[PDB]
Amino acid sequence: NRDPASDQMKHWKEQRAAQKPDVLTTGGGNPVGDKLNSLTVGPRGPLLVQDVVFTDEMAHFDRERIPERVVHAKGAGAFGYFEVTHDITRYSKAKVFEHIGKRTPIAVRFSTVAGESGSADTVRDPRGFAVKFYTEDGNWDLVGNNTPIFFIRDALLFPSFIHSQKRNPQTHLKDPDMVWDFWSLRPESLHQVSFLFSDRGIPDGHRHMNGYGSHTFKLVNANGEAVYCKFHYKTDQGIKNLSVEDAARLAHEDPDYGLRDLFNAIATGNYPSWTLYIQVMTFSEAEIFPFNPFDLTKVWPHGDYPLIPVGKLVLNRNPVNYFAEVEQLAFDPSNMPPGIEPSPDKMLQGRLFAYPDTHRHRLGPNYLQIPVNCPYRARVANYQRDGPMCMMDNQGGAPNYYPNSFSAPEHQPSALEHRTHFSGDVQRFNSANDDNVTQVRTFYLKVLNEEQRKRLCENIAGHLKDAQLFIQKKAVKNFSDVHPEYGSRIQALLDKYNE
Amino acid sequence: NRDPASDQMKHWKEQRAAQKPDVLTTGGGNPVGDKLNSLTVGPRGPLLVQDVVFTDEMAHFDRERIPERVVHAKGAGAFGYFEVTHDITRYSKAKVFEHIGKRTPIAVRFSTVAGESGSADTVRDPRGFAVKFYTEDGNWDLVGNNTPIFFIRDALLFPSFIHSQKRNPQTHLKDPDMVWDFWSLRPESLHQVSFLFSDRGIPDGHRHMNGYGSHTFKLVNANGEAVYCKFHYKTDQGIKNLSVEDAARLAHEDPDYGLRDLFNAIATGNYPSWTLYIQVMTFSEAEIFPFNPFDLTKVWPHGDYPLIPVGKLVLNRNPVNYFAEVEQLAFDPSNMPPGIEPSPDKMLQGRLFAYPDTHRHRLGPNYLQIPVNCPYRARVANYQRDGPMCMMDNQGGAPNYYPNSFSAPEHQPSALEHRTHFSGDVQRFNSANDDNVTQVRTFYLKVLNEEQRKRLCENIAGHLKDAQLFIQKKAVKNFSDVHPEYGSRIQALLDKYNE
Amino acid sequence: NRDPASDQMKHWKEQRAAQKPDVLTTGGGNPVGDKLNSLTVGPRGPLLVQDVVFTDEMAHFDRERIPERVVHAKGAGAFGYFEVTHDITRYSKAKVFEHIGKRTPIAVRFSTVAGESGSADTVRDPRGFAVKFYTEDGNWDLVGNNTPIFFIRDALLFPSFIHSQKRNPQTHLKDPDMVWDFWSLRPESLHQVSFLFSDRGIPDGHRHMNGYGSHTFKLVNANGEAVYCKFHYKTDQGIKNLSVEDAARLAHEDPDYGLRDLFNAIATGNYPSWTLYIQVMTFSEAEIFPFNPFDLTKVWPHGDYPLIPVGKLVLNRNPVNYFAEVEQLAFDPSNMPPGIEPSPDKMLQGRLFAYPDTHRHRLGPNYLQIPVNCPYRARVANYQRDGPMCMMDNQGGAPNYYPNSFSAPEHQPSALEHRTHFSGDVQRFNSANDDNVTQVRTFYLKVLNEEQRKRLCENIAGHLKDAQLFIQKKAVKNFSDVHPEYGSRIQALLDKYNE
Amino acid sequence: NRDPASDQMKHWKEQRAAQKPDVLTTGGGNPVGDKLNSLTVGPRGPLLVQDVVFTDEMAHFDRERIPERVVHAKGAGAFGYFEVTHDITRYSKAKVFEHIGKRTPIAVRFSTVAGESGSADTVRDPRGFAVKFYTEDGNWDLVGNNTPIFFIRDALLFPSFIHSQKRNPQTHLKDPDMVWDFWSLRPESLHQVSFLFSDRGIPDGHRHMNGYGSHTFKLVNANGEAVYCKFHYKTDQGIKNLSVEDAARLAHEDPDYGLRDLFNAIATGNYPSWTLYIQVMTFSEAEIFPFNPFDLTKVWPHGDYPLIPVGKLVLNRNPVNYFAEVEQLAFDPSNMPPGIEPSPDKMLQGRLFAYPDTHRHRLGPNYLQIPVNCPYRARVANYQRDGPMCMMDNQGGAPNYYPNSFSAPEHQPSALEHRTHFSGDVQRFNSANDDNVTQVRTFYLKVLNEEQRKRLCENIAGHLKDAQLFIQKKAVKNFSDVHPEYGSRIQALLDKYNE
């Protein structure tokens, strides 16, 4: 016997023992007589249109693929539950946090970022760590990453950043010039770049990394009082990373290392868990925070904003069919129940639009009707109707316009969003110069130790060496701005590489 | 009180009784605080991206429409059952005919042909009468019309015929030149044209017309013996047509006369029914039939092939949501259970491909998963997987390749198709000159009487008069070939029209 | 002969002259031997998969349809130019107004609102009048209607309104209860409802109605100074409407009356034209305006805001292929060149999102690449790439990320939007009670005379009579609020109808 | 100065002289003022819907992806020409072979089979080698592989085979049980499996492998005489393969080795070329051939059917934009011009349907209108119209029905297909046992030498060892059926592996 993953079919057959195999049918339910030989006129004659068994099956095979995610295409999923362990109702009225011990089903998908569906798991890249909470007040999607920060602070640079990280438009090859030209021209990326090229750049699977909402969010309590927060979910199995050489080897020996590791852990009862925490910042504190508290390239120092325990995230169930339950999973940051709201973070603001938008394209207009995406713990009732692939009863014969005098769904004022006051000129404010080095300097000098600082520079140099000289110069210049020793170490390695 | 249809919302509300209205939510299940006022900065300020209630609802509104059927776009639907009244098991082993008293759920859609979704019901045009039988051996779709024949006998002319019956590619207007240039060039259309311009061209709603499979099909019994057949389902409400005047009036007074009539009939308990019969022709008789027995422009004389009773079709349930149960309804002639097979009819052969093909486009790759199209009386099990908008569990973790040693679905020999022999060259055999007038003459002289022929010619002339003279000449010539008087009577009317 | 539209093919044929017919080919360009007879084994044998001429043609026929517009599905289009006649550069720097005599090609689509693609042209309903200006600074889409106002003032009520104006979700029938329950519950609709049921409710074709931008927009001059404006394009052919009796007759006699009328006018050289004017309101006046100047249910009194001439719109070219040039036409209000910007109008704000969004669904992600939608008078250069049905060269091998050090496209600071200041809480401000009767009373008393008021009430009562009594009561109450006589006259008619 | 691929942007930059970069615009051609900062209310305020620069760009980014090819997803493309070097007009009248020296432009795509878009190039797998010839008689797509044979001989097993070669439906991992259970149950796969696991399984890039049409095709000359044939295009660069070790290293060192290799070869003027040959078998010989001449698992012995020189295939132009010219490339085996036709090969017959079918899905209904797929050397003229994303003029106002009296396109009888006679019952004839070992034995003992036989078995055992013992057993029995020593050697290796 081998690992559970390897024995998937062996186990399927066993848990069905004795049962006679089902009758093979066409999509329309018609039994098939012989699905191994085509219908022709004579043994060596032409294929007939009358062979509807062939066409029915072949037409579906021809339509199996859907567009992969534009970003985070390579991933793994699992299911489990969220359990409240601490009371934070003084900050949020969200039903999901209602009482200690309360359980809410969750769906989770882990992923890399730049690689396509056939890429390797063990490569340097941030890691997606999305969590869907099926709450009574609808779904709450906490679409986080394995890092508290990100490369940029304005959504307008996101398509460009992603493009720079992917393939050259003409050669279809990874392009270090594209990667470093963008990063060198946008130094705000220094913080996450430093994290990315540190040991945390290649987690040992998905179970040995933390998750973060990254963005500053807003929590509102029953009294209508609001505070800003940060979500953190630390791994209970400990942080563990793969060395550059081990990652390269696994890259070809098992491009699906993360998928396999997660499935086997769950299959053997070694359920991975994370502890969910929040950092809280009052509106007054946000007004005096040393940096823009809504700047995604900044963290909230733990010393000034301690982590507050909330609950546990446990994954105890593997997908039964990957395509249906994982490939089709759709997380929308805009999916927020009462008690949880967005902050002015320019990046988060852009995401409120982007995810539902790309989902309507990738999956379809009615993607929220796909089982794994349906808020099955809530009661969906509204005035939306039709659309392609309309499932269920499409809300039957219920009045389809609001307001109406026929007892159809009514809005609930208690669900009204928290009112914040805003004043200012409507314009495109430049945020390109919002302190790009201070916290980066702290990370390099205080967070990292000597051994990791060494690896960090070697990691950066090893990749940056392939960019043109003028690009290497600008990049080094930015690293020197963070700390002269930082840029100096990289330059020395670069000089050597440039042989 | 008014008609049941008019009180649709009134009844829905009364049905709700004192039950409190559901909470209005977003597609993601999040309760909505105020869905009547957008989120802005100040009462006269800009709209915020942060208003995800607006975007969620509007995005779905923006995607409500799907392509209408390329033909038969305007229609009505209802549900009910099929009941076997006689034993025809000597001809077919199909489970749907298994035993007297046997009940099978059915779905039916009635429709016109050329008009778009907003067109009128009471216009001259054939009428679609498609019946979906949800059997244990999968769905059987008998996609019939209100006529036993059709305008052409080879599928390659179908797109052109439909094009000629629709809008001019430049002006987007109905075009008499297109309609009659095609018909005058393809005389095989004389039989159905004669039927179309007779009183039968405009039935009084959908309950007062017959249904026909039109094509010759093949039935196979338990002993493997086969016979060719024709399906006929006659209205138990009696044939009833609308005069040209009444139809024209209803066209603007009630473009949805057929829809309203059917819904009210069922709503008031006046369930419409049809008696299903079959005509049987042995392979020996097919060999000596005076015409090509598989020629869609020919009927099988009842005197030689009597109608044999089989059962009854009853519609006793209105759809609850039109879009979900009717607009998304998909009938595939290729959906035939064991015991029912296609004949060599070139037209039928072509339809075997066209319907599932257009359905994958109009509805989606997984259209057979839409509730109303699912063969819910059968167990769908096969090696097909994925595709956009994949519902249910996508057959879970079952082995997805055949053959396999893991107990997955197996084909069933008993479901093998009947063996028919064919010999000949592979070529495009011309059928354009396959007797286009004989049966038309019988129809004109025997089936119709004097007053009916008079109206027939008046109806033809009234439309043909708008076509160019050279087209009128050729058209009249064809009618003259059927019978000198047929043509002369039309020419006289034409001369009058052309002043 | 007959009208030019009827002779479309005749002319095409004559245009062909002595030229011989081209060779008929498959979509792949392969010459076809016989496209009138299918490939079979023997004259009465099975159809072969090998008949790829059949499949190629049928598969395309099966995919001819695309979803119709969610609203304004029934329409007609034409092309021509816009010519500046007056200098308004003091208000707007838009290149399209650059200098007197300057011409800019335009595309226009006229339409009804509620009816589907097969509905009749001459029915009571607003009329769409969209104009696309192909300017050097990109396309400017002025998506107007034949009315200066609308039924609602917040986009959140739009989907509901449209739903109430269309078919009952269960019966698929027009529903007076839906129509009037909505209007009676939303009194802000009184203004446009009065206009709709007035004689203007049914224009005589598209050439005899005015066009309006409806919304308040913003104009910005070269000095960066801004003013608010309203766009008005009055018909030079003069206002002309159809009586209720004539409209009903044309509804069945010629449902495409509007299409035909326009095509023939242009085909005979009787090019229809409109004079473009604008009303200008300074920001100072906007703050003093007695009503919300951004309220779509309000007009700007001509006495206080005189119509200022700008130019002329001329339609002198019919479409060659309707589907390609008209059905695929896409107008996005968000398509505004420098010099023209939106106002805070809550309705306009919503439209900024809805159109490009619905277009990505109805047509496709790359719909701006469809010839008629391409901004061919400008140079499209950006960092957008790929997507389905990607035409041209997809911008070749140009750097696809911004910023970059490789000379790819750069933004132009001069195109920056005008900066306005806004202050206030972020909330859903209720606008349901923003004076719903004042201007409606002036319309009823001044704009209309006695005979018109007579018809207005007859048309209203003629439709409202079919709604339930409790709905009739609410509606009348609203009319009475406008003017006691308005309501009492309708009630008198209703009492008679409810005979 | 690096390799040409790496300097793609550097070169794009310098080829624009000192030209001012283009103005960055929206998709609608509107100039952008600042595409680096979003529009908000105040420096730290919410994002506005009014920022249509953001939405336009983000919405397109959200739709960049299209489904990857269901198979052969990972590939590289290039363009060039085909030049006739010898006269084979006595066999085929195809215009592409008209006269010595005649050049026809071609498009080519190379690929692996099982791996997704992000997979590695240097892995064991067949190699796709599709060639599109843009001839005057339309496009001719010779969709070949780097092997003259395939694993199966009936299209009904194709979806299953591909499924077995891809990922487990539950774990999403490669599955050796799936791979070998299928192959062991279907020994017809022995021939191609032997080739696949030989050194030819991992070619050194795309330039060092042969191309094959694989299937038996039919050629028809000017006199209507027909012969069967096989296409062979041998590499002029010579056969060269990568060792298992090197391929593994490259798998992670450069997942895009094939892409880069081909691009640089062409960029440096080292244009790769292939010599096209054909084998000819008369209809008489096909009747006596010891195997089914249309059996895809069989080759035609060169000794009895020598290679006949035809012309040269040369690739001398790289794609400018990969997505537009390569990812969107569509090859349809059914695209055959007069002079070239299919044979009864059950696999080929199935492919006649599948490719256009999947293309309508993957790309869109009008995928033949995408530039790279358009038969631009031909004149497309037919009665096909509309469909989503309809480009050009949709054939303008030309009559859209056939036949017609208005001079629209007409079929050309000279393009009629060659007539073959067939006699037989319409049945599903078994081909599972059509000699699965004979040619495999000659390959093993005669085609390979001792050294490569050693490698063959090691490669097989190295993969087979991970499957369950019962599967290994069955697979070994099949190899033993080929030759006792074939199975013996593999079994010895398996024993060593299974400890």
Ligand code: HEM
């Ligand atoms: C918040 C309110 C509104 C929303 C959300 C909205 C939404 C829509 C949508 C989704 C379409 C279909 C577009 C297509 O498929 O091409 C449409 C069409 C149209 N709308 Fe609106 N609309 C609104 C208000 C109005 C108003 C006030 C006007 C006029 C000033 C207007 C004029 C039109 C016209 C003329 C068309 C048809 C354009 C064409 O001919 O292609 N709409 N609208």
Ligand SMILES: [N]
């Ligand atoms: N992302």
Ligand SMILES: [N]
């Ligand atoms: N049809």
Ligand SMILES: [N]
């Ligand atoms: N609209």
Ligand SMILES: [N]
């Ligand atoms: N393939």
